[PDB]
Structure 1
Amino acid sequence: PVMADLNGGLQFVPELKEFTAKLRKELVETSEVRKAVSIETALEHKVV
């Protein structure tokens, strides 16, 4: 029997779950704050 690792060295990044989850949090955080700050600077412009 043959066993082929076709896993791009992913085995070697530790705490793969916590790390994966951090990457998603930081992307979403960056998106959310930019969308909110966008909407609010738009409204502050409109009021003025």
Structure 2
Amino acid sequence: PVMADLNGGLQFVPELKEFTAKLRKELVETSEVRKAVSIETALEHKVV
């Protein structure tokens, strides 16, 4: 019986769960911060 590993080297990363969580958190925080800043800049521009 054979065990083919088609994992793409994903096992070699330390704490893959934490790394993946931090990637998602970084992308999410960037998206929300950019969206909020754009909305507030738009509201300030419209008010002015």
Q: Same fold (TM over 0.5)?
A: yes
**After TM superposition, where is structure 1 displaced by more than 6 Å over at least 4 residues in a row?**
none
Question: Which structure 2 segments of 5+ residues have no match?
Answer: none
Q: Which runs of 5+ in 1 are unaligned?
A: none
Number of aligned residues = 48
Counting aligned pairs with the same residue, the percent is 100
Task: Give the aligned CA root-mean-square deviation in angstroms.
Answer: 0.4
Structure 1 CA distance for aligned equivalents of residues 10 and 40 of structure 2? 41
Higher relative contact order (CA 8 A, sep 6+): 2
